[PDB]
Design a protein around this nucleic acid. Structure first.
Lengths: 95, 51, 40, 92, 63, 254
RNA sequence: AUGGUGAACUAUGCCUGAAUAGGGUGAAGCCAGAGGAAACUCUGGUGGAGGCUCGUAGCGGUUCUGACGUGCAAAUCGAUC
RNA sequence: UUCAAAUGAGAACUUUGAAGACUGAAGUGGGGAAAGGUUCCACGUCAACAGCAGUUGGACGUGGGUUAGUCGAUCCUAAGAGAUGGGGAAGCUCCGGGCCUGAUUUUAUGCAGGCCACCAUCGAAAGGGAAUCCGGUUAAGAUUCCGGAACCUGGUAUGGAUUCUUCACGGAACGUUGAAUGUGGAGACGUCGGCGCGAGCCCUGGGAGGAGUUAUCUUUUCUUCUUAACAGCUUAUCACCCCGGAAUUGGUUUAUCCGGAGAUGGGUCUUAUGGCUGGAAGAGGCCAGCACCUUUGCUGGCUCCGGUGCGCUUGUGACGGCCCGUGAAAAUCCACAGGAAGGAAUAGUUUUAUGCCAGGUCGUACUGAUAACCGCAGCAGGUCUCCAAGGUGAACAGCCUCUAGUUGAUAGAAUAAUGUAGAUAAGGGAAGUCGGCAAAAUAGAUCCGUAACUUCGGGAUAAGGAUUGGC
RNA sequence: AGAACUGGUACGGACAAGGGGAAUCUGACUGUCUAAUUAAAACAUAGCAUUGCGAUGGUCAGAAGUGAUGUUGACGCAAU
């Protein structure tokens, strides 16, 4: 039943940023000098490389990373399928 | 800190101050020979403790 | 660049930046601290 | 316009001197660097000069190479067309 | 205190007195800083009370 | 005789060098694992950052390709039109797109290239500066030779195995506008291997330069100098031939 | 003439730090109205640019060819700049 | 300085009081860096010193004083001193495997196996950095000691948990094991202008507490009204929010802008502080009448009430404008992953929590300057920082007030010319002098007005004139 | 900002606080100089040019290393 503390932020930087709070160890994960407290984000498909804080602050972007991987996979499945069709046509064609 | 903090240096400058002190009455008295004006005497404004 | 010690605007006594507040004598959360502008 | 008569752009910096020709060049490249340019990607009139030869889009944040003073030139556009002409013929 | 209580209350704001300069008093930069904040705040109150229209507010905002 | 003259002072000494450590680097072109039939070198430009070392931009590219040895990254040379999110491929079977790096043999005739190797694996020697460019005139299938036209206008005969990057280097038309201020010129000088401001030789005393001395400022002597001449003796117009201004021409050519 | 020995002064450099009261002036180009088919324009405005001007910390050293000239000082002091 | 007075063999300069000035970004405040090298503090001497006395002092002599897990050095890396092949030079001189384990076993012995790139130390006592304040005490130390309270760093102990086929929550954002292996943030970094958060300040009143004060009066007007790191609560700003949800010529700033790669509404989120609270804290010492030789001890003020002036000042946090010029780098805190392997009344982690030992290094005095630094000197000189919020002025200046600091090493009596700083001069007005040199002169600011020339930017505060109080 | 009634010789009342105009010479400007008799017209300046230089660059330090050139480059660097 309490308040508290992750990061998101900002946009200098590198893209970000969304990441999730594993809790607060000694303070929250709350911009400063030295990072004390904690980030994750829950793990597999926003794929967040992250930022903790206590330290003022950067993630790579949560929607955009699944879209970069899903669209990469989506690019791949079509490039491979085209290469697969291309391979079918070329082998099949003459003699 | 400060000054001048280096441990080794500090000691030498401290050591020197005591070494520059007046004589003990006695050496004049058991006596060798000497209108005993120490000489080493080092001084308030004047001279320099040594470069 | 930054943190020095913080110099009292009333008494003029240098106390920490990590202290919020000043005292030389009963200044006692007069808060009257300026950090040093960090050197020259 | 401004309270200006002809057109300084930059000129006020100079004060008085420098001469028509010298100040004109220095006016042209920088005022055209400042001019709102569409990013190729978004199409918003974003582009600003980050540094000489560095151009950045405020909206997309894609950064791109170009001329120092201007985002682009004629010269760069000529090079891109000829390589493409060569490339087309080879491909067929 | 007496000089300030005598400045509620006009004065010591004479032609002779005013120095520093017309624009060191009030360059109009500072006056613009007060006023520009008033204008957008009053416009916000006008909108929320529902006076005047969204189209009229744009022309007026711009004005 | 003299005091040492300025040229002789360049020599070595801290006052003469550049502040090498403010330089980001080289940006020599890597040395292919092999193949590169599309994207065993795949780069994405993620950024464009200025080099103080050539007053032109670099492109940060990464490069992710494997093994143990793998070699990857870094700051290769930016071309005009190269941008963040655009792909770089570096090697033999790369596509012929601007910013992609390949041997001259693989390049089509009549395409502007920059950053060309004198000798293979030397990583890129030629055309080089901002808005400068090579034009590869000739190939054919030449096993033997690729004929490249430099930015000076000399035709160099270099090996077809020499890599180069397609396009001209970014930041061109940098020469065009004049600095207009001593102050602008100064900060730029701090970047490079230079002492300045520069006083004239004629402005100087005879002890400081051959051009010095005399009540009125003048070169006492001629300028056009004997090529054998020592460093100290050689100032002014070095081994010139002709002087003024207003004629000549030509590509000379051995 | 030979060998060392001084960049605590000072010259220039580099790295790393910091300082510049207050004010005037008035560039980019943008908003209103009004001209205008447009290109553009005028007029109010706003925002502030500059090896920017008046001047403070600071830095400099023109002038009295002043004081001093066995000095306070082996180049100082005021008033001026 | 003067004037009483203290003391002394001796008093213009030692000291007490009174009365008077002066110092004011420090021609004399506070606290330090370098440097000095004990100058500090006490006491007692006065031959020598202090350009003079001298009871005095910073002379002299004789003791004493500086207390660090939490300040700072140590550590790091920077411009490179550069160890460091090989090679010149006889030579001096000079450039360019190491790391991690598994049988045993919990003592670490012991046999045996596996990884990996460009390598040392030093270099800023003012880069960066793990942690501490409150007041109390000394003759002389103090964020060190102490009384209270807190916290850290390094390398373990254990009930109470939880969570146990390695987590519920919230549509979402988010929220309250672990080897081989890759990759990263923080630290971390320009300049201009630049809004907002907010504090302490200046300030005022209603007001609580305690001072000054009337030839004559009305209130006056005054010192003040204190509180820590940092427990844990916060209404939680901006910025992101390609959150959901909505579906647009509308939204919106100081300015630029933003949007239909979905604007405003409007259910959320993240998330700052030297921040507001709330507690730390009925923690704690001084003035006012009173007692006491002193030690001691007494209640109340410390449990005030609201705000203004943009005073954008610092700590922080938007951004726009900016360079042929692009604004360092590391140790260290921490994290994403990507996984062999290990989960049975056994056994396995992650901690709160409170312990549990330690913390082993060297510095701390004082001056920091018209008297302890440098310059031969008790040298009108030079030489860095912070205090840019003291009060009226902000055009500079002057004067102040509870900070606080001082009266320089010569005095007395008089007052001529000469001289050195300095003012004012009839009326005339550059005649003087190389030269209008100086000095006078003009002066702020508003209104009105403003020529030639010009690269139309300027010239320009042209010029000229007018105006300004006290209320 | 505006008005009042009225005083003073004076209302920037003190102190501080630009005297203005024209002709000519030079050097475009801001900047730099003889630390201690020259701050100027001298120097720098940015503009404009010629010349060398294709890379183990030429050019400069240097016995060699190796440095400096350049981790750059004929839109650049050097010399004038």
């Amino acid at each position: 039943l309490k308040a508290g503390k992750v990061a998101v932020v900002v946009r200098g930087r590198y893209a970000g940023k969304k990441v999730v709070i594993v809790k607060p160890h000694d303070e929250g994960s709350k911009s400063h000098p030295f990072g004390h407290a904690l980030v994750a984000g829950i793990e597999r498909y926003p794929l967040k490389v992250t930022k903790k804080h206590g330290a003022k602050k950067v993630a790579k972007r949560t929607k955009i990373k699944p879209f970069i991987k899903v669209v990469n996979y989506n690019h791949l499945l079509p490039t491979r399928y085209t290469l697969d069709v291309e391979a079918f046509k070329s082998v099949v064609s003459t003699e | 800190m400060a000054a001048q903090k280096s441990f080794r240096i500090k000691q030498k400058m401290a050591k020197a101050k005591k070494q520059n002190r007046p004589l003990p009455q006695w050496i004049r008295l058991r006596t060798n020979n000497t209108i005993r004006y120490n000489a080493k005497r080092r001084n308030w404004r004047r001279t320099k403790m040594n470069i | 660049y930054n943190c020095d010690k913080s110099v009292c605007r009333k008494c003029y006594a240098r106390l920490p930046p990590r202290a919020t507040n000043c005292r030389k004598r009963k200044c006692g959360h007069t808060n009257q601290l300026r950090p040093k502008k960090k050197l020259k | 316009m401004a309270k200006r008569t002809k057109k300084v752009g930059i000129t006020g910096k100079y004060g008085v001197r420098y001469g028509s020709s010298l100040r004109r060049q220095v006016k042209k490249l920088e005022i055209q660097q400042h001019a709102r340019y569409d990013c190729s990607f978004c199409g918003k009139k974003t582009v600003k000069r980050g540094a000489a030869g560095i151009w950045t889009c405020s909206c997309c944040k894609k950064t791109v190479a170009g001329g120092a003073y201007t985002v682009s030139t004629a010269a760069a556009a000529t090079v891109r067309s000829t390589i493409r002409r060569l490339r087309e013929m080879v491909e067929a | 205190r007496a000089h300030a209580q005598s400045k509620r209350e006009g004065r010591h704001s004479g032609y002779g007195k005013r120095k520093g300069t017309r624009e060191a008093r009030l360059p109009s930069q500072v006056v613009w800083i007060r006023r520009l904040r008033v204008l957008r705040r009053l416009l916000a109150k006008y909108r929320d009370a529902g006076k005047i229209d969204k189209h009229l507010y744009h022309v007026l905002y711009k004005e | 005789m003299g005091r040492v003259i300025r040229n002789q002072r360049k020599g070595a000494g801290s006052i003469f060098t550049s502040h090498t450590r403010l330089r980001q680097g080289a940006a020599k072109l890597r040395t292919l694992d092999y193949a590169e039939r599309h994207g065993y070198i795949r780069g994405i430009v993620k950024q464009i950052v200025h080099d103080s070392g050539r007053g032109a931009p670099l492109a940060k590219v990464v490069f992710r390709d494997p093994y143990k040895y793998r070699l990857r990254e870094e700051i290769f040379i930016a071309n005009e039109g190269v941008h963040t999110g655009q792909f770089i491929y570096a090697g033999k079977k790369a596509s012929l797109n601007v910013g992609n790096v390949l041997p001259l043999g693989s390049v089509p005739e009549g395409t502007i290239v920059s950053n060309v190797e004198e000798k293979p694996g030397d990583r890129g020697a030629l055309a080089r500066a901002s808005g400068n460019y090579v034009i590869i005139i000739g190939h054919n299938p030449d096993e033997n030779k690729t004929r490249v036209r430099l930015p000076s206008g000399a035709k160099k005969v270099i090996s077809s195995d020499a890599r180069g990057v397609i396009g001209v280097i970014a930041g061109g038309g940098r020469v065009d506008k004049p600095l207009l201020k001593a102050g602008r010129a100064f900060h730029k000088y701090r970047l490079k291997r230079n002492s300045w401001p520069k006083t004239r030789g004629v402005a100087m005393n005879p002890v400081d330069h051959p051009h010095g001395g005399g009540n009125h400022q003048h070169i006492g002597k001629a300028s056009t100098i004997s090529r054998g001449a020592v460093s100290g003796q050689k100032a002014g117009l070095i081994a010139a031939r002709r002087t003024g201004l207003l004629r000549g021409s030509q590509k000379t050519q051995d």
